[PDB]
Design a protein around this ligand. Structure first.
Ligand SMILES: Nc1ncnc2c1ncn2[C@@H]1O[C@H](COP(=O)(O)OP(=O)(O)O)[C@@H](O)[C@H]1O
Ligand SMILES: [Mg+2]
Ligand code: NA
Ligand code: NA
Ligand code: NA
Length: 379
């Protein structure tokens, strides 16, 4: 009866299980290997993952996400107060602690972030239970290296609320290191850089691994830099193309903007594999179709600054670790936004044409490690 590895992500989560000497990442019911960290509440049902993200445009007050920015923090924490302005769902104080308040089945109900995160974790558990054919009771769960003790504690609580014994809370970069087998080089000291660009957050972590033992030498990043911000540049481009091509400002209508956001996301992903993408939105604003397109290089210009800003934290982590570019043994790409060729290319130029570790899908890499370490901990 195997234990599972879970990446409980800001924007996407992923579950894996080690079976027969190899890691298996479990696709969700729509066949996706990651699941958005979205919970939605309606008059009749509670929805998690893809089904929850797919109705966001029609249910903004009761469709919850970004729980991981609240988890284990105080309500009066300035990070939470600032984040609250950007969400359409309500956050309330409940003696010092934030809760998310929504309508659900014709009533007002309020939930701690770890309750929200436990619903996400429950989805990940169920998907693994149908894949294996038995109940799952054990898991490793990942968290970012910067998480304080309370953020860890609340995430581990999220696990126990989902009916899991959490075997260990481990750092995301460590799990990605373990993915790539970097704890199983023996008597020998190796320097690893984890470059983690996801949906909401960019984290750079430098690790030193000695006899398979892990030391964190530096972390740096930007908790508000990720895939969504690139989506948002695409939105603003297409908003303005709409104001030229049909003479109307859609920026005020939340539904339009949020459906456009979704189409931009899909178009972004297509641009990692093709040099151009089409955007086809039936009845975007006041009956009017929006059909258009954009090149990769045009996308790259729109994001120029954001992509180039991923380098300042790499440099910073290297100074804080007191190493140079050259003394990194392994460069590991993690996070779904590292699929973007310009991001990969900038990093390569900066590390003097070094070949990059991407054999493991970067959006799965954390869960990959998590699953290996889960199985190790079961014995
Ligand atoms: N092929 C792709 N090209 C560009 N971005 C991608 C691709 N696939 C996924 N992404 C982006 O990666 C982000 C998801 O990152 P992921 O690492 O899976 O979750 P998290 O960052 O929350 O841990 C989203 O912004 C998503 O749009
Ligand atoms: Mg991640
Ligand atoms: Na993730
Ligand atoms: Na990230
Ligand atoms: Na992220």
């Amino acid at each position: 009866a195997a234990a599972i590895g879970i990446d409980l992500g800001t924007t996407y989560s992923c579950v894996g299980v080690f079976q027969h000497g190899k890691v298996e990442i479990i696709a969700n019911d729509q066949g996706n290997r990651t699941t958005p960290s979205y919970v939605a509440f309606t008059d009749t049902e509670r929805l998690i993952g893809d089904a929850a993200k797919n109705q966001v445009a029609l249910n903004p007050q009761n469709t919850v996400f970004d729980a991981k920015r609240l988890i284990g923090r105080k309500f009066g924490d300035p990070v939470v107060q600032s984040d609250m302005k950007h969400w359409p769902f309500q956050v309330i104080n409940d003696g010092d602690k934030p809760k998310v308040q929504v309508s659900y089945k014709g009533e007002t109900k309020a939930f701690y972030p770890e309750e929200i995160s436990s619903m996400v974790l429950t989805k990940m558990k169920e998907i693994a239970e149908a894949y294996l054919g038995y109940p799952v009771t054990n898991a490793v769960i990942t968290v970012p290296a910067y998480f304080n003790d309370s953020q860890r504690q609340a995430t581990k609580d999220a696990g126990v609320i989902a009916g899991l014994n959490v075997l260990r809370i481990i750092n995301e970069p460590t799990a990605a290191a373990i993915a790539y087998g970097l704890d199983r080089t023996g008597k020998g000291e190796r320097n690893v850089l984890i470059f983690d660009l996801g949906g909401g957050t960019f984290d750079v972590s430098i690790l030193t691994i000695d006899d398979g033992i892990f030391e964190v030498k530096a972390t740096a990043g930007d908790t508000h830099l990720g895939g969504e911000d690139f989506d948002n540049r695409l939105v603003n481009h297409f908003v303005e193309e709409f104001k030229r091509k049909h003479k109307k400002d859609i920026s005020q209508n939340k539904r339009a903007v949020r459906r456009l956001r979704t189409a931009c996301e899909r178009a972004k992903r297509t641009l990692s594999s093709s040099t151009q993408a089409s955007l086809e939105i039936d009845s975007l604003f006041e009956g009017i179709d929006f059909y258009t397109s954009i090149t990769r290089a045009r996308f790259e210009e729109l994001c120029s600054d954001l992509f180039r800003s991923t380098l300042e934290p790499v440099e910073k982590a290297l100074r804080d670790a007191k190493l140079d570019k050259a003394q990194i043994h392994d460069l590991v790409l993690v996070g779904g936004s590292t699929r973007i060729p310009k991001v990969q290319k900038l990093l390569q130029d900066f590390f003097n044409g070094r070949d990059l570790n991407k054999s493991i899908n970067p959006d799965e890499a954390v869960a990959y490690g998590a699953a290996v370490q889960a199985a190790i901990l079961m014995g």
